[PDB]
Each structure stands twice: as C-alpha cells, then as structure tokens.
Amino acid sequence: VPFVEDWDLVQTLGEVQLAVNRVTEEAVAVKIVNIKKEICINKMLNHENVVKFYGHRREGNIQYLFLEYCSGGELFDRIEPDIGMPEPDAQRFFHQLMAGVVYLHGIGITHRDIKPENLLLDERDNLKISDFGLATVFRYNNRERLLNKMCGTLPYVAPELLKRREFHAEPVDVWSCGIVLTAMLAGELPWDQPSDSCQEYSDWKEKKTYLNPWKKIDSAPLALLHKILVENPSARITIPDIKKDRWYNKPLKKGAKRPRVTS
Numbered sequence: 158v159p160f161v162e163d164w165d166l167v168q169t170l171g172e173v174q175l176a177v178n179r180v181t182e183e184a185v186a187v188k189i190v191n192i193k194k195e196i197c198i199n200k201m202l203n204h205e206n207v208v209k210f211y212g213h214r215r216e217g218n219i220q221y222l223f224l225e226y227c228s229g230g231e232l233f234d235r236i237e238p239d240i241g242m243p244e245p246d247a248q249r250f251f252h253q254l255m256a257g258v259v260y261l262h263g264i265g266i267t268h269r270d271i272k273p274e275n276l277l278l279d280e281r282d283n284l285k286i287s288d289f290g291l292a293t294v295f296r297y298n299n300r301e302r303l304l305n306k307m308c309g310t311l312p313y314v315a316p317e318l319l320k321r322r323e324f325h326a327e328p329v330d331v332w333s334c335g336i337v338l339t340a341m342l343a344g345e346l347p348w349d350q351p352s353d354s355c356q357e358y359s360d361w362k363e364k365k366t367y368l369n370p371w372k373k374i375d376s377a378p379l380a381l382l383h384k385i386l387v388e389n390p391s392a393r394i395t396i397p398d399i400k401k402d403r404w405y406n407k408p409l410k411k412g413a414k415r416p417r418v419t420s
C-alpha cells in the first residue's frame with residue numbers, strides 16, 4: 158500500500174513527538190534522540206499496563222523509537238495540588254500500576270524511576286508505565302543481581318539507595334509506588350528525600366500521621382502506606398502481600414459509565 162510508511166509529526170508531547178500516519182491516521186509516539194539498553198529492554202516488553210514498543214529506526218546519528226501513544230497524558234496532570242484525586246480513581250490506578258510492576262519484576266526488569274510523570278493514560282484512562290531509560294535487568298538466569306547505582310528522583314527514592322552501598326531492586330520500585338499512592342491521595346509529596354535530616358521523614362518514622370500529607374488520607378489506604386513506606390527494605394511489604402491488603406481489595410470504584418435507557 159503506498160505511503161503507509163509515512164508519518165507526520167504534529168505536536169510535542171515531551172524529545173517525544175506525536176506522529177500521525179499519512180494513510181491510516183494511526184497515532185503513535187516517536188522518541189527522537191544508554192539508548193541501546195532502552196531499546197533492548199523495550200523489545201522484551203509486552204503488557205497492557207506497559208507502553209508498547211513498536212520498533213526503532215536509526216538515520217545517521219539520530220535514533221527514532223516508535224512507541225504507543227497515550228492520549229490521556231500523564232498521571233501527574235490528574236493529581237490536583239494539595240487535594241489528590243477521588244480515592245476510587247487512585248485505587249484503580251494503583252491496581253494497574255501493580256499489574257505493570259508485577260509484570261516487569263516477573264521478567265527481571267526494574268524501572269527505577271516510577272513517578273506520576275512516567276505513568277501515562279490511554280484513551281480509556283488505562284495506566285501505562287513509560288520511560289525505560291533508567292531501567293535495568295536485576296534477575297537473569299534465575300540469579301538476582303544487587304544494584305549499587307544511584308538512579309531515580311529524590312522524592313520517590315527508597316532510603317536504602319541513600320544509606321547502603323548495595324540493595325535489592327524490587328523493594329525500591331515498591332517504595333516509589335507508595336510515594337505515587339501518597340501523591341494521588343494527598344496531592345503532595347511527603348518529603349524532599351527519605352533522610353533523617355528531613356524533618357518530614359523523621360515525623361513519619363515517629364508515626365505523626367496527624368500531620369499532612371497523612372491527615373488527608375483515610376485510615377485503610379494509610380494502613381497500606383504504613384506497610385510500604387518502611388525504612389528497612391527487608392521488612393517492607395512485597396507486592397504479593399500488597400495484593401492481600403484490605404484497602405487494595407476494598408470495593409470502591411464502579412465500572413465505566415455504559416449507555417442506558419429507562420422504560
């Protein structure tokens with residue numbers, strides 16, 4: 158079919174450009190630029206809560222990554238400052254985030270930079286994990302590798318990344334998911350970084366939940382956050398146990414509004 162390979166770049170999404178196919182009008186996100194590793198990790202991924210990788214093309218010194226377009230934009234833009242969002246919406250996004258993280262950890266990949274800027278939404282508000290530029294393999298041939306590199310974004314990083322030379326990959330991603338859950342439910346980040354020099358972090362370890370952001374969060378999701386934001390990564394809740402949590406399993410969210418008529 159002629160011209161089926163031509164795409165028009167119509168707007169800047171992030172560089173990342175929205176590309177529209179000249180024939181079919183199919184919309185895709187194109188990343189125009191570590192990049193070999195990002196492509197290699199992306200080629201391994203196939204999950205409904207992970208932004209799809211369609212392929213790559215190299216023209217000279219510029220690398221083009223063809224990726225799934227998520228028209229709902231960033232989760233970050235659904236969080237109202239100092240408010241958050243309705244608890245049933247945050248629960249549904251949290252369920253989708255856990256499905257994506259389970260998947261990645263199951264194939265031995267750690268994201269290392271989970272935050273609302275990197276969690277995108279499709280046309281039906283389905284959450285998709287994006288940006289695998291800091292991601293790495295932590296399990297290969299059923300042998301776990303401890304990590305040592307400083308990766309991430311300070312408000313979302315687990316305390317062991319700042320205190321220990323080596324650390325397990327999975328609890329780090331679990332921690333950042335708990336900071337994402339805090340932001341969704343309170344519209345604010347709890348600390349600049351998880352260090353004893355940070356008053357907000359010390360207040361949390363002293364269980365002062367009568368202070369913000371914790372005072373804005375209902376006791377059932379707050380009980381979950383008490384199990385995720387645990388300083389010792391060996392005592393921190395695992396994802397199979399998050400899936401058994403009371404709030405995680407609480408009925409809150411009605412399904413998508415379907416068309417209906419009366420009489």
Ligand SMILES: COc1cc(CCc2[nH]nc3c2Cc2ccccc2-3)ccc1O
Nearest residue numbers: 170186208224225226227230287288289
């Ligand atoms: C799945 O892997 C990646 C995905 C993305 C981006 C994909 C993508 N798809 N759709 C969008 C974006 C960014 C963005 C930002 C804002 C609105 C929409 C969109 C970047 C690097 C990646 O490695």
